[PDB]
Design a protein around this ligand. Structure first.
Ligand SMILES: NC(=O)c1ccc[n+]([C@@H]2O[C@H](COP(=O)([O-])OP(=O)(O)OC[C@H]3O[C@@H](n4cnc5c(N)ncnc54)[C@H](O)[C@@H]3O)[C@@H](O)[C@H]2O)c1
Ligand SMILES: NC(=O)c1ccc[n+]([C@@H]2O[C@H](COP(=O)([O-])OP(=O)(O)OC[C@H]3O[C@@H](n4cnc5c(N)ncnc54)[C@H](O)[C@@H]3O)[C@@H](O)[C@H]2O)c1
Ligand SMILES: NC(=O)c1ccc[n+]([C@@H]2O[C@H](COP(=O)([O-])OP(=O)(O)OC[C@H]3O[C@@H](n4cnc5c(N)ncnc54)[C@H](O)[C@@H]3O)[C@@H](O)[C@H]2O)c1
Ligand SMILES: NC(=O)c1ccc[n+]([C@@H]2O[C@H](COP(=O)([O-])OP(=O)(O)OC[C@H]3O[C@@H](n4cnc5c(N)ncnc54)[C@H](O)[C@@H]3O)[C@@H](O)[C@H]2O)c1
Lengths: 300, 310, 299, 310
């Protein structure tokens, strides 16, 4: 299988790097306006492959994306300029890779997924935004540290906007099949309001802290996008909190935000409107209205 | 790191094979009364390794378990058609009276991981005989029933079992407890998720699923004489959790002070697995019906063990 | 993608298990005249999947092999086996015409030739495990002997999977060095007696294992799974496998093992390595035996 | 187990990232003069772990290196566009003067894996300062050049690089030696295989490949400013080799008693990697031309070290 990445900056190349080491696809093609940059990243990642799996890593143009099952959109130059980028990029991608699933990372990722969606003319399940997939992973990693258990055992969700209005879903969170409060107690911890506030801050301000420390985030999302690409290429039928055009959510219509969804060869194949407290559900409504306004004020 | 396997039969060898293919340990030592059989299995599996990971697979004596971080106990008789797991108990208790001493002599720091049926009572047996802290003697328990529950639900709803969160508690046997009350997919109550998904689970459908899990070993035994691929993978995964100090959460068996009022009994509850074996236990909130079934399961295990002075 | 396995015995089930644990294919279909046996293995292996990778394991009929890109064939004995392939091969291909056929049934070289003649496929799309297991054994034994990971031992076996197989000592290397000096100091130089022990270890391996446990399946299971992975990922990796070969040391139209490139098309290329006079004569004799065995049976 | 990385720059962070995605160790500690930098990289990589493997990734002081089984030294300046690796020597020897003793306070039993360029001289600087046995101070050396040679030969032949067994020896830099003479593909001599594949490997083809290999770093730095993905995977693989006691064979750099007549010089040869670091060295099969090139390469490294008194 062949995967494409348009926008070979830090996010795109980190994604290419994860795909290569984890052997997700037999072939990865990086596309970037800066052609020497794509080539440099491609060569560097190609050179990792003898340590891991056979992957034909290379740089190319949209034409080289032919037959790609998935193409990751991580291109950026504001929402004004970014939206103009996607106007250029999307139709060129689909020209070459008609049946590819689009995976959007470019921020603000919710609004950009909707732009990608309006431009593509494909079923909404075919245009997938990374959405809160990274926030969910952050929430899990932070509960993991707090509980000192493997994040792979923590099953917690972040929904709504990949941004400031995102909703941490505490009510239905579970660890190893056990409700979060009661697992925490067994572990010797109380999840006090103070503990919660601290974990909330940890997730909500995560990107800010990393940016101020090293200028950008890319390792986290690189891995999350590689994982979604894998979900798509293997027709995994796995559940992830990703963003996609949603007919309706809490009364808000035709908006893209993250809910738990089933990912497979067709992209999003199912959406779960899950179980939230009144507090969380209202937070999700407020989040959905934030994203709605933002997209309309741009015509998408 | 070295892993020991005692009993190089179907279960033992399938576990060693999973360990090899997954590169879990750098060295796997197979120990069997029948040295030629362990030797043949070790050769056969050694020959897989050039296709996977570097693993020194070999057959050995009990002295060769030395320095093992975990030892899997898979020696002893399996149930034949018509027979329950609890019926193996007298015979396999006698085996463990031979096995456990010899293991702790060669590898006194090893975490014991028990597979031999009936696995909950055998874990208790091993615990009594070993003199070890309860955390260090772990039975596979319902880890396989939980896997079976998730897989049948996965097949039902056509989603990856990885995304299905449901588990089984109590006895690894006829009295096990499917915990429907807290099962979720995508943060949603399982029954709600299924309806939404347009394949709802009626009472009848659940009954069929309960049977799918409950009678899986009997079906498999009748069709091919034994079960071993599923438990082999499950054992390799627990060995991995221990050797990597994973702090993962699994439904496994261990000696438990008190559960629904029944005292000093080994059965499966959600537990945290790491370098020291079981490092913590959760006693989940259950529906009244599940709580009662779990009590019943525990009294059964307690009785069976007591009758032998365990 | 989908892999099919015809013959769900020890070898077929062990292959399916390896495929499942390694997450090689998304769907694995087990087919066997003994319907309950295939079902049983399918359930047993399905239950492993939550520990590893999502894989739809199930038992079925030929119609279920549909869309398979690889199908493993692991179903006077020689006469009865040939006859199995006469029943099985047509049906597999009917249901999965684009499937590469991977043959495990013994004697694997003759059965590969049998499968080839019956299938009417390009020669590259009918591949026998051949000496792939013999090569892994040669490497594993050299690995134990030198105490280095077998992955750093590149040494192979050519010819018949069986008594006439040829260990290619002449070009064996470990870290770009010739085996013999590499050992001579790793501190243990490989006498002619040591090479003889190793030869026996490889050549008699199946005998020792069958005597000890009645059958071999783990080694071949892993090897087949690996070949299935090469095929499905279009790996273009090099393996010593068996396939219909126009000419070898003068012998014509015989199936035996040589170094070959493996990809989506099955055997996509074949290397005819230079060998010592010893090895060359051995390979010829090996080819001669297989040609004769095939001819007698009418293939 | 625990791995330390000193220098949380592009190379150190990409190495940690590879370790986390491949699940090589249970804990990874990033140490850097710029603490906010290590912290940002550590958070960023921790957040990847739910998608892959459990790994406690964190930033820390030298003190937090305690108990590390290996410590990767990736601290110091990298090449500017057009700058050669040897031009970094004096600046990075001074960095190592600070780093090496501070690592060995916290983790005197750690195997050291040196990435900082010029990696051969830096390996020899680490060796002198550490007071460790030669085998325990490992430089990545030509491990990445070997990979480039394999990857470019793989493109040339259209086979998986995993099937190409060709290596690069000597300096990790302009004077490195491509060992064409003994190169094989899947057990077969390279010339023999190239022809079977429809390739005659002309002198032009060899020149092209040599340049592809020799100048890879210059090209990548010009295009994106630095290299880190290739070496990150290479370092992770070496860390894995050490932590698992692999006994794998790799071309890495270590202090070498005598090479082609040149004495007491650190440079890349095929070596066996295990828990002790380098547990064996092979002086390989070379043509007269290759041999002379290795001697010249060793001489450049010898004089560079000696001028600094190392
Ligand atoms: N969780 C998430 O969804 C998440 C997390 C982090 C960053 N992001 C983001 O994703 C994007 C990338 O981040 P980044 O740091 O890599 O930025 P980056 O600038 O480093 O890389 C961006 C690039 O896209 C390339 N590019 C721009 N326009 C292009 C076009 N029209 N065609 C081809 N290529 C084009 C640019 O040349 C450049 O290399 C941003 O929008 C950043 O905010 C998203
Ligand atoms: N879920 C589970 O916990 C689970 C699942 C399947 C099977 N099992 C149990 O596993 C046991 C083994 O099953 P099996 O199929 O592998 O049987 P097996 O007979 O095939 O193999 C068992 C073996 O143990 C060996 N052995 C016996 N006593 C020994 C001793 N003192 N020291 C060394 N080796 C000894 C025997 O020689 C034999 O090879 C049974 O109790 C079976 O019911 C448990
Ligand atoms: N390296 C090698 O190439 C290697 C190594 C080991 C075994 N083998 C060969 O593997 C083989 C199969 O071995 P095994 O151990 O699994 O034996 P096995 O008997 O256990 O299984 C073989 C099976 O084929 C099934 N089968 C037979 N005829 C069938 C038909 N026409 N349609 C579908 N299914 C049918 C049988 O029911 C049975 O289950 C033997 O030929 C064996 O010698 C090869
Ligand atoms: N194959 C190879 O051997 C290879 C390949 C590529 C790069 N490298 C190299 O490795 C080094 C790093 O490259 P880079 O790109 O990461 O550079 P970088 O500048 O991005 O990161 C280097 C860092 O070292 C940290 N550091 C410096 N001195 C320190 C000290 N006393 N203690 C703790 N931390 C300290 C610095 O703060 C900085 O973060 C260079 O020498 C570069 O050439 C080697």
């Amino acid at each position: 299988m062949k995967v494409g990445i348009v926008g070979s900056g830090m996010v795109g190349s980190a994604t290419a790097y994860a795909l290569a080491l984890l052997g997700v696809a037999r072939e990865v093609v990086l596309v970037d306006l800066d052609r020497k940059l794509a080539q440099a990243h491609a060569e560097d990642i190609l050179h990792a492959t003898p340590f891991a799996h056979p992957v034909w890593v290379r740089a190319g143009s949209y034409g080289d994306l032919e037959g790609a099952r998935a193409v990751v959109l991580a291109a950026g130059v504001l929402l004004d300029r970014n939206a103009q980028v996607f106007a250029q990029v999307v139709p060129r991608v689909l020209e070459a890779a008609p049946e590819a699933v689009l995976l959007v990372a470019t921020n603000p990722v919710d609004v950009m997924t909707q732009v990608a969606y309006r431009l593509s003319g494909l079923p909404p399940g075919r245009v997938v935004g990374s959405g809160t997939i990274l926030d969910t992973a952050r929430f899990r990693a932070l509960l993991a540290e707090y509980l000192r258990v493997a994040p792979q055992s923590v099953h917690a969700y972040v929904l709504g906007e990949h941004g400031d209005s995102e909703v941490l879903v505490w009510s239905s969170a579970q660890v190893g099949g056990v409700p979060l409060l009661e697992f925490a107690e067994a572990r010797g911890r109380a999840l006090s309001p103070e503990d919660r506030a601290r974990i909330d801050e940890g997730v909500r301000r995560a990107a800010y802290r990393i940016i101020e420390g090293k200028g950008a985030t890319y390792y986290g999302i690189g891995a999350g996008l590689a994982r979604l690409v894998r979900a798509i290429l293997t027709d995994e039928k796995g559940v992830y909190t990703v963003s996609a055009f949603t007919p309706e959510v809490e009364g808000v219509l035709e908006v893209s935000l993250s809910l738990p969804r089933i990912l497979g060869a067709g992209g999003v194949e199912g959406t779960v409107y899950p179980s939230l407290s009144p507090e969380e559900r209202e937070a999700l409504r407020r989040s959905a209205e934030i994203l709605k306004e933002a997209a309309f004020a741009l015509g998408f």
